[PDB]
Amino acid sequence: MSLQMVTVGHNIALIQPGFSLMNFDGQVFFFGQKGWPKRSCPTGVFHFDIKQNHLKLKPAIFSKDSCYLPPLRYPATCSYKKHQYIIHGGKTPNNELSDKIYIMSVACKNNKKVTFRCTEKDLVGDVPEPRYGHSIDVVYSRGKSMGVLFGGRSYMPSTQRTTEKWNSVADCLPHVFLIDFEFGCATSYILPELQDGLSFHVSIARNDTVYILGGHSLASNIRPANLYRIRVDLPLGTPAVNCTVLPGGISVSSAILTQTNNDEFVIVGGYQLENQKRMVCSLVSLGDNTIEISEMETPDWTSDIKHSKIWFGSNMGNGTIFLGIPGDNKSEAFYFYTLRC
DNA sequence: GCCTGTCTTACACAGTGATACAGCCCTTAACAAAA
């Protein structure tokens, strides 16, 4: 794992905590810019290309049949296999939470210049309340595909919300949501094993299962060291969901996850306590019914990283993470690194 | 047939202690109006 500093072009201000990166056919893209999109890039979607440790953000265009989704911070994202990206929830530049779900796909790649399709999917049934900091992944069971959504935070319900605490947030009830994108429907499942709310956790999806790692629970103000396996079977039109607690769970919120090889993932970064950062790294190796979490060699962090109180980042896709920390003195607002695996 | 920060001074005015100017109630006698 080699750490490398990155320089940024004129529009560095766009990058903020809560941003996301999506990878299409090796090409990386950036979404969730700070502020509302400007004339320079009306979509809020950017080619995110790092050449010789220099990062350029170049505006990307939408197809004629696209939505223009608002920039979203801490939305739930996953990748769907004809490869597309699912974005659900998040905070908008006006601090509202969206209940909408957007789908990003490549509409046209002409002479290495990508046009995107952003389509909004209506959701009916048990729609999950607007959220941020929650997970969504795709499971495959019995030749059928289903979305699994869990966790996050939201504002108080319209009945109890008051202007003195107008921005107060609470964890959502820990109901797993099965989401059929084909029909646009959502079903909620209460499980006894998920008693507490959880947000900013990590989710790993393999076949018919999603594992839930770390995260932070507001009510207890704990980052629990639990690992949850959630299995989904889809026999015809009657889905079934079952959860199992598995000991050996890491305790981490806001960690970043990257795939280094099939059935092996690396977990880097995050927070172990409010004032402490998780400097260690984990390797997760997947079996068809087993999951293994092993400590790995901690990278050669610089002193700036070691002493930073906050860091934020995203997975670039090619086993490489894009990281960031703030700096004061004279000078830059943010300093960015790329950690390879 | 551009966008959009950064940079640079123009510009007005704030607000200092000093200073110039106007307005203050009188000061001589006498009538006298209200009470």
**What number of CA atoms fall less than 13 Å from residue A51's CA on the CB side?**
6
Radius of gyration of chain A (CA): 19
Find residue A281's DSSP bridge partners. A296
**List of long-range contacts for A51-54, beta carbons under 8 Å, 24+ apart:** A53/A4, A53/A5, A53/A6, A53/A7, A53/A338, A54/A6, A54/A7, A54/A8, A54/A9
Strands in A76-80's sheet, in edge-to-edge order, are: A61-62, A113-121, A101-110, A84-88, A76-80
Q: Are A33 and A16 in contact (CB under 8 A)?
A: yes
Beta strands A135-141; A124-125: pairing state: unpaired
Q: Are A324 and A14 in contact (CB under 8 A)?
A: no
| Residue in this structure with the two tokens 């989904």, named with its chain if needed | A232
Q: Are A211 and A291 in contact (CB under 8 A)?
A: yes
Residue A47: both structure tokens together: 């080619």
CA of A331 to C1' of B6 (A): 16
CA of A132 to C1' of B24 (A): 74
Gap between the Cα atoms of A61 and A93, Å rounded: 20
Nucleotide closest to residue A41 (CA–C1'): B3
CA of A164 to C1' of B15 (A): 40
Q: Are A245 and A227 in contact (CB under 8 A)?
A: yes
Q: Considering only residues 299-318 of chain A, list those whose CB is below 7 Å from strand B.
A: none
| Elucidation method | X-ray
Q: Are A176 and A189 in contact (CB under 8 A)?
A: yes
Does strand B come within 7 Å of the CB of A333?
Answer: no
**List of long-range contacts for A197-200, beta carbons under 8 Å, 24+ apart:** A197/A151, A197/A153, A197/A170, A197/A171, A197/A172, A197/A173, A198/A150, A198/A151, A198/A171, A198/A174, A198/A224, A199/A132, A199/A133, A199/A134, A199/A151, A199/A152, A199/A153, A199/A171, A199/A172, A199/A253, A200/A74, A200/A133, A200/A253, A200/A254
Phi, psi torsion values for A295, nearest 5 degrees: -65, 145
Does strand B come within 7 Å of the CB of A40?
Answer: yes
DSSP label of A115: E
3-state secondary structure of A147: strand
- As a three-state string, the secondary structure of A192-204 is CCCCCCCECCEEE
Does strand B come within 7 Å of the CB of A330?
Answer: no
| Residue in this structure with the two tokens 């990508």, named with its chain if needed | A114
Does strand B come within 7 Å of the CB of A162?
Answer: no
Closest C-alpha to A22, from A90, A99, A86? A86
Nucleotide closest to residue A38 (CA–C1'): B3
Residue A154: partners with Cβ closer than 8 Å, 6 or more residues away: A97, A129, A130, A131, A132, A169, A170, A172
Closest C-alpha to A4, from A334, A296, A322? A322
Residue A142: both structure tokens together: 């019995």
Q: Are A174 and A196 in contact (CB under 8 A)?
A: yes
Gap between the Cα atoms of A135 and A244, Å rounded: 18
Nucleotide closest to residue A35 (CA–C1'): B4
Gap between the Cα atoms of A11 and A9, Å rounded: 6
End-to-end CA separation in angstroms for chain A: 5
Gap between the Cα atoms of A317 and A153, Å rounded: 26
Residue A304: both structure tokens together: 């700036």
Gap between the Cα atoms of A75 and A8, Å rounded: 24
Residue A210: both structure tokens together: 């999603």
Q: Are A26 and A83 in contact (CB under 8 A)?
A: no
Which ranges of chain A does DSSP label H, i.e. alpha helix?
Answer: 303-307
CA distances from A46 to A29, A108, A156, A258, A314 (A): 6, 15, 34, 21, 15
Q: Are A108 and A63 in contact (CB under 8 A)?
A: yes
Q: Are A181 and A147 in contact (CB under 8 A)?
A: yes
Q: Considering only residues 4-23 of chain A, list those whose CB is below 7 Å from strand B.
A: 13
Does strand B come within 7 Å of the CB of A38?
Answer: yes
Q: What is the resolution of this structure in A?
A: 3.2
Q: Which nucleotides in chain B lie less than 7 Å from some protein C-beta?
A: 2-5
Gap between the Cα atoms of A121 and A182, Å rounded: 10
CA angle A193, A18, A36 (to 5 degrees): 135
